[PDB]
């Protein structure tokens, strides 16, 4: 029942789309886990969704560890935690230290940002038992994707990428790919919980769908998300 | 409305002069923002204007983060640039990144560092990791106690530009030289005591408001004198910068 | 007193080495008196003592604490302490610092997990007077993360000067080949009886956990009237080469 | 207001520079008013102020404290602060961190002890805005631990690295003269003859604060005067008139 | 007068044997200084003699600085040599320097480190920065839990690195003699024969403080005298007369 990296690999091979959503609290993590969400992303997006800041840069490693521990008490699903700004780019050794704290806090994988210049860090961590989700995002994108794949990234995440390009990347790398605003050709999808639940007022990002509307329970709204992700309904045009 | 690096690049291409002024308090930052200042420099010059010291060297990273947070609560559209203080970034590019990351977390949109070609590697290290850098060359206050010069300055400018510097700031540079640099580097240039051919200008707020006694420096103009309010003084500065009448 | 020299003489003589995990003074004294030659203060305490789902959260402070506890109870047995996750993989210098704290806490040897990429660290520590037990095969610290690789890992640590090589859940035939290939003594768990010694988590072999025993684990409490008798039986079977049996391999 | 530029112009004009150690605000103000151009907040305070047998126990905190004290008393004089034993020899990076603390405390220049092996550190600091006074010859920090060519090499190494000043202690006068005529930067001497570009003495030594006879290269300037102000002015006058050091020193 | 590195070099040159003993307290340090002991070793052996531990590995840098300060308040002319404790100096030459600097600040005049050729780079690093180094080779207690040409290579490496003194422990006398004759610096031995330039013993061992049989290369100098003062003077005298070790 527990979702592992092998689980994601089998799903990629079988073509079964992976459902990912952000999570920052125990209650919602538990709700999403039981609702079918395979990967829970404790992302630095909490700097805006939870802390109410204008950017994610001020989020600290302590903040990430706190929310990771919270989510871990609630959730079978795999917990992925973001290495926060400034906590891992100094060197691969610093990255390892930070990632280690996140793993000790309950994470099963850590997410880092950067292209080819970060590939050495991906390898350093993966070789030491820390699964890595490499966040990237034409030829530059492919190079970044390959670099991290070669380095052993467990998952490659793309944000705001041409559908056609994402498809090519997904077929080029051996590891599963996850996307947001990158089309349905990716091995899976991810959305910020608060966004797909219509927590924020006014229109929503073009690449985000409100799954709250149409249902009278968050539990149903999430299941609908998972459903459309596997049915390849979402993302649509 | 928000001023971004892209905004500055478009201004450089259009020949629209950029107005920068130092800021260390929320109230004045809001006033300058509303008066049209496009870049607010939370500089280590506060070591002298705010702390009353004889030089900027004693300013700490905590001091810079504090004033950056203050300015951030008052700024609206203007871009906030924060100085990496003496001793907090020159040990290594790794130390510089650590210090710069603290400033960005405090509210900065760009950090400024002083030094020539020997600091270019640090500029590259920071920019590649998401931290925009303003490279300060020429007469650098942090080294106040310390033909060929022309080429040396040009090489410093090119090194930082090639390293990815978002902006190059020149202080006390021959007008003719500064013009050549501005026409050579791809990034916008800002000057003080460097002529009006730079892509923009900067002055210490307290200097241009005539807060200090005596005569103002040669490359500084008192904008409070001859104007009816602090707001008007700042608007006058922005207007003369864009009209290319300042510096004269 | 059990020294590295003792272990090497035993490997040469074909006399099997008995190792068991230990996290408390009382049990350590009991196992020492019962003939256990190596006491492993392992990060397995993260599960047996702390009740966690993995060993990753175990800190260096935790390891030093249990090492000090075991040192107050042990007498003749050699104390081996695990370097916990995150405390030694950053660099060989960090590993040395962490291992030094464990030696200061009473350890006589430290255990680290990793393949060829850790051989440089093994060398760095051994040269500085810190005996190293190199753990290869199934490494719990990388649970969230083949045959030739195992051989390469063993050879690399042996060449780097590892005092002992420990293998977990490895096909018997392979374990046998490794043991006959490296110069240092080998210890196994779920690796067959051809290793130079064996190790088991104390709580597992005492039947402390409910449910069926792990495949490579034998309940030594059953059939005996005391914890002392259970431990003595384990030591006896290891030396008699009756454990692990075909069923535990 | 004394700057590095001032010192260079003085070297070129042959005007001897007067330097004296200072550890308190009151004496610093007195020396500044008396014409002393360089105030050395030296680790010699380990003996003159702290009463120790050597300068090795002096800490960076002690140096910053005395530097801050002197900075509240000095007006025109340039403040030079010693990097204390242990605070800068680990690496050029450590030296910079230590030197930066001294500059933050009020120093205008820092002094380090060492030969060619320290030149890389001199360059590192100077390039970063920290003026360096390189101390060669007899270096008190190494008190527990052809030879003329080595001194020349040490001086040239630091000069080439960008040292603002080179200080020589207990060196053959003829040798000190050659060095002074060779390096581009000003030289300051103590027990190195009068041909250096300037002189330095420990305040307490030249004020006769210690019992017994002063060192051979030291002159008691208190004798013959009835005010510290006059004693210091006599030192400045004799240094500039080149009557000190005399043949006897 | 005061015993300096120069004093030791002159003694080696003249063949005058150097007397060294361990010291961990001010009172005993003063007594040994007055009795003619030329080198006082504030050694990590205090982990066993003072702290009562089974090995010297648990001794900390704080412990070493504390005992060094204590000995420095009692000593007058003798040279104080302080051991860099296990874990405090082997990480890098930079770490060793920081640790050694703390010991010098605490009152040491020289620091001792354990290790062969692999530690010579550290010896050079410290010596160049004004910290005299005593290189301890042979049987090193810090490696207790873990040949002729190896010893010679270790001695040569440290001498070439500028070690002020080379200390040999438990080495064949014939080998120790060759080393002493080949290195430029003075040698001190314990269980290394009498052909070294000097000798050292743990104070507690030579005063017969521990119960049990006397260690092979150790002599009980307390026996036959009724004052610790006389016991120490006897040790110094036998070392000088080359009658100890026998």
CATH number at residue C76: 3.20.20.60
Structural tokens at position D54: 């050597």
Unique residue bearing structure tokens 């700004």: A85
Report the 10 Å Cβ neighbour count for A32.
Answer: 29
| A45 assigned binding-site residue | yes
At E101, which helix (H) or strand (E)? helix E93-105
Please list every residue in chain E whose beta carbon sits closer than 8 Å to the beta carbon of residue C105. Answer: 58
Shortest distance, CA B66 to any CA of chain D (angstroms): 18
Residue written as token pair 């707001």 = B231
Q: What angle do CA E94, E97, E103 make, to 5 degrees?
A: 150
Distance CA C118, CA C156 (A): 9
| B/A Cβ contact: 3+ pairs below 8 Å | yes
Minimum CA–CA partner of C118 in chain A: A128
Q: What is the CA radius of gyration of chain C?
A: 16
Shortest Cα distance from E3 to chain C (angstroms)? 32
Instruction: Give the phi and the psi of residue E185 in degrees, each rounded to 5.
Output: -85, 160
**Chain E residues close to C3, C-beta within 8 Å:** 145
The residue segments making up the domain with residue A145 are 1-237
Q: Which H, E and C letters describe D63-99, residue by residue?
A: HHHHHHHHHCCCCCCEEEEECCCCCCCCCHHHHHHHH
Across the interface, whether the CB atoms of E143 and C126 are under 8 A apart is answered no
Q: Which tokens sit at D112?
A: 């380090």
Is residue D111 a known part of a binding site?
Answer: yes
In angstroms, the Cα distances linking D237 to B32, D6, D242 are 55, 18, 8
Residue C168 catalytic? yes
Rounded to whole angstroms, how far apart are CA atoms A98 and A83?
Answer: 7
Catalytic residue, from C37, C101, C123, C168: name it.
Answer: C168
Nearest to B170 by CA among B202, B194, B141, B195: B194
Local structure of D229: helix, strand or coil: helix
Tell me, yes or no, if C89 comes closer than 8 A to chain A by beta carbon.
Answer: yes
Q: Largest Cα–Cα distance of chain C, in whole Å? A: 48
Least CA distance to C130: which residue of chain E? E146
Whether chain B has a CB inside 8 Å of the CB on D75: the answer is: no
In terms of CA atoms, which chain C residue is nearest residue A99? C86
The phi, psi pair for E203, rounded to 5°, reads -50, -50
Residue B87 and residue D108: Cβ atoms within 8 Å? no
For C45-52, the CB contacts below 8 A with 24+ separation are: C45/C21, C48/C21, C48/C23, C48/C201, C48/C202, C48/C203, C48/C208, C49/C23
**Phi and psi torsions of D224, nearest 5°:** 85, 0
Tell me the two tokens of residue E183: 């290195």
Is C44 annotated to bind ligand? yes
C18, containing H or E segment: strand C17-21
Which residue among D101, D123, D169, D238 is the active-site one?
Answer: D169
Residue B35 CB partners (closer than 8 Å, separation 6+): B231, B234, B235, B238
Show residues of chain B in contact with D109, CB under 8 Å: 145
Q: Which residue has the tokens 């605070």?
A: D87
Of B90, B115, B145, Cβ closest to residue D109: B145
- Please give the Cα distance from C176 to C155 (Å, whole number): 14
Structure-token pair, residue B204: 């210490």
B247 preceded by cis ω (within 30°)?
Answer: yes
H or E stretch covering E137: strand E133-138
List B residues 4-33 in contact with A (Cβ-Cβ < 8 A): none
Candidates E55, E90, E98, E116: best to mutate against C (most CBs of C within 10 A) is E90
Cα–Cα distance for residue pair A23/A46, rounded to 1 Å: 9
> Residue C73: CA atoms inside 13 Å, Cβ hemisphere, count?
20
Name the nearest CA neighbour of D172 among D202, D140, D150, D156.
Answer: D150
| Of B219, B138, B207, nearest in space to B178 by CA | B138
Please tell me if residue B130 touches chain A, with a CB cutoff of 8 Å. yes
Neighbours of chain E (3+ CB pairs under 8 A): C, D
Q: What is the resolution of this structure in A?
A: 1.8
Q: Tell me the torsion sign for CA atoms A182, A183, A187, A188.
A: positive
Q: Tell me which residues of chain E, numbers 193 to 232, contact chain C at a CB-CB cutoff of 8 Å.
A: none
Interface check for B152 against chain A (CB to CB < 8 A): the answer is: no
Kindly report the CA angle at E88 between E158 and A87, in degrees rounded to 5? 120
Query: Using alpha carbons only, how large is chain D's radius of gyration in Å?
Result: 16
Nearest to E146 among C93, C100, C131 (CB): C131
C150 secondary structure, DSSP code: H
Please tell me whether D43 is known to bind a ligand. Answer: yes
The C-alpha of C60 sits at a distance from chain A's nearest C-alpha, in angstroms, of: 12
Q: Please tell me the distance in Å from A229's CA to the nearest CA on chain B.
A: 32
CA distance A224 to chain C (A): 29
Distance in angstroms (rounded) separating the CA atoms of residues B95 and B84: 11
What value does the CA radius of gyration of chain B take, rounded to a whole number of Å? 16
Secondary structure of chain B in HEC code, one letter for each residue? CCCCHHHHHHHHHHCCCEEEEECCCHHHHHHHHHCCCCEEEECCCHHHHCCCCCCCCCCCHHHHHHHHHHHHHHCCCCEEEEECCCCCCCCCHHHHHHHHHHHHHHCCCEEEEECCHHHHHHHHHHHHCCCCEEEEEECCHHHCCCCHHHHHHHHHHHHHHHCCCCEEEEECCCHHHHHHHHHHCCCCEEEECCCCCCCEEEECHHHHCCCCCCCCCCCCCCCCCCCCCHHHHHHHHHHHHHHCCCCC
Chains D and E touch, using 3 or more CB pairs below 8 Å: yes
What residues have CB less than 8 Å from C148, skipping those under 6 apart?
A: none
Q: Which residues of A touch B105 (CB under 8 A)?
A: 57-58, 60, 85-86
Q: Which backbone phi and psi does E52 adopt, to 5 degrees?
A: 75, 20
Alpha-carbon distance D59 to nearest alpha carbon in chain B (angstroms): 19
For residue B129, give the chain A residue with the closest CA.
A89
> What is the b/e burial string over E167-187, where b = at least 16 CB atoms within 10 angstroms of the residue's CB?
bbbebeeebbbebbeebebbb
CA angle E228, E231, E234 (to 5 degrees): 150
- Distance, in Å, from the CA atom of B14 to the CA atom of D52, rounded to the nearest integer, reads 68
* Structural domains counted in chain E: 1
d(C-alpha C185, C-alpha C133), whole Å: 10
Contact criterion met (CB below 8 Å) for E38 and E4? no
For the beta carbon of residue D197, count every other beta carbon within 10 angstroms.
22
Cβ burial, residue C230 (10 Å; 0-12/13-18/19+): buried
Indicate which technique resolved this structure: X-ray
As a whole number of angstroms, the distance between CA C57 and CA C50 comes to: 10
Minimal Cβ distance to B146: which of D4, D96, D101 = D4
| DSSP class of D130 | -
Rounded Cα distance, A39 and A77, in Å: 5
Q: In sequence order, what are the residues at sequence separation of 6 or more whose Cβ sits closer than 8 angstroms to the Cβ of residue E102?
A: D86, E61, E65
Chain D, chain E: beta-carbon pairs less than 8 Å apart: 45
Is residue D144 a contact partner of residue E104, using CB atoms and an 8 Å limit?
Answer: yes
Contacts of C100 in chain E (CB under 8 A): 86-87, 90
Report d(CA D88, CA E110) in Å as an integer. Answer: 19
């Amino acid at each position: 029942s527990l979702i592992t990296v092998n689980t994601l690999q089998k799903m990629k091979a079988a073509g079964e789309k992976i459902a990912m959503l952000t999570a920052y609290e125990s209650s919602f993590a538990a709700l999403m886990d039981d609702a079918g969400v395979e990967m829970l992303l404790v992302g630095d997006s909490l700097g805006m969704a939870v802390q109410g800041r204008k950017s994610t840069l001020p989020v600290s490693l302590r903040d990430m560890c706190y929310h990771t521990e919270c989510v871990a008490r609630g959730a079978n699903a795999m917990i992925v935690s973001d290495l926060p700004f400034g906590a891992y780019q100094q060197s691969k050794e610093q990255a390892f230290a930070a990632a280690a704290e996140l793993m000790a806090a309950g994470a099963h994988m850590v997410k880092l940002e950067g292209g080819v210049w970060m590939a050495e860090t991906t390898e350093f961590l993966q070789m030491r038992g820390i699964p890595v989700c490499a966040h990237i995002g034409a030829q530059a994108l492919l190079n970044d994707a390959k670099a991290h794949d070669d380095a052993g990234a467990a998952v490659v995440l793309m944000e705001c990428v041409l559908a056609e390009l994402a498809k090519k990347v997904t077929e080029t790398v051996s590891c599963p790919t996850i996307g947001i605003g990158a089309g349905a050709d990716c091995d899976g999808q991810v959305l910020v919980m608060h966004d797909m639940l219509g927590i924020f007022p006014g229109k929503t990002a073009k690449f985000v769908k409100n799954f709250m509307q149409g249902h009278d329970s968050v539990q149903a709204a999430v299941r609908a998300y998972v459903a459309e992700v596997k049915a390849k309904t979402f993302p649509a045009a």
